[PDB]
């Protein structure tokens, strides 16, 4: 608890300042601090946690892909440096994924009783196991993929019972599970069927929304469409 001595409200305030400053490592440390106070997170606070770690692992994943690509070219028809540096980046990425999954397990998920909070955290759990799956190569890979699938499936079952088809969390979950199917599970047809069904069911529910909800739903539906255009 590096943030153990700071007020919860001060950690949340500083997480917002870090977002404005694009200091995403600081933002993640502040939001880890806030979570470790042991209170549940509001909608906005869950978004701060998700934004902060998304951006930290986003930069690690982009770095890993650059290095892994240089490493693969070195192994076509040199020393250990490229492998060693890819491993260093990969190890730091796995640590950030382990930290997020740790917060979800201790104790965000078990205290999340509302559909919007529970689905949000289960989606995150799927996402961080998916990032681990992206770099996994040993004995653990099958179990990592199944941990992602299981978290996403539990989130999907709740979202389908409890949320309208245009709910941005439900739409964001479905988008991410479809990327899981395409990129990780080697199931491009499942990816394409989930993205299509998700898009079509949201389309048929747009008439119920305010101009502001409409704009949040259609932004994510456009990412389903961009993926389907790429995949078909």
């Amino acid at each position: 608890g590096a943030m153990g001595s700071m007020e919860r409200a001060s950690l949340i305030q500083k997480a917002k300042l870090a977002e404005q400053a694009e200091r995403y490592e600081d933002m993640a440390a502040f939001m880890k601090g806030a979570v470790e106070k042991g209170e549940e997170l509001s909608c906005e606070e869950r978004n701060l946690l998700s934004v902060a770690y998304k951006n930290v692992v986003g930069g690690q994943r982009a770095a890993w892909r650059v290095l892994s690509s240089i490493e693969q070219k070195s192994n076509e028809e040199k020393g250990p440096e490229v492998r060693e540096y890819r491993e260093k980046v990969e190890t730091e990425l796995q640590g950030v994924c382990d930290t997020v999954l740790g917060l979800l397990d201790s104790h965000l998920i078990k205290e999340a009783g509302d559909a919007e909070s529970r689905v949000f955290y289960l989606k995150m759990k799927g996402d961080y196991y998916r990032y681990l799956a992206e770099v996994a190569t040993g004995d653990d890979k099958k179990r990592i993929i199944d941990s992602a699938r299981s978290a996403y499936q539990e989130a999907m079952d709740i979202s389908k019972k409890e949320m309208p088809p245009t709910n941005p969390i439900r739409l964001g979950l479905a988008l991410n599970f479809s990327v899981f199917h395409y990129e990780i599970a080697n199931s491009p047809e499942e990816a394409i069927s989930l993205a299509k069904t998700t898009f079509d069911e949201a389309m048929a529910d747009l008439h119920t929304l305010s101009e502001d909800s409409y704009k949040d739903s259609t932004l994510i539906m456009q990412l389903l469409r961009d993926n389907l255009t790429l995949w078909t």
């Binding site: 978004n47 941005p168 979950l173 790429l230």
Partner: peptide
């Protein structure tokens, strides 16, 4: 392009 996944913030 690359595969699009959801933004960190959804609403």
């Amino acid at each position: 392009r690359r595969n699009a996944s959801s933004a960190g913030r959804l609403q």
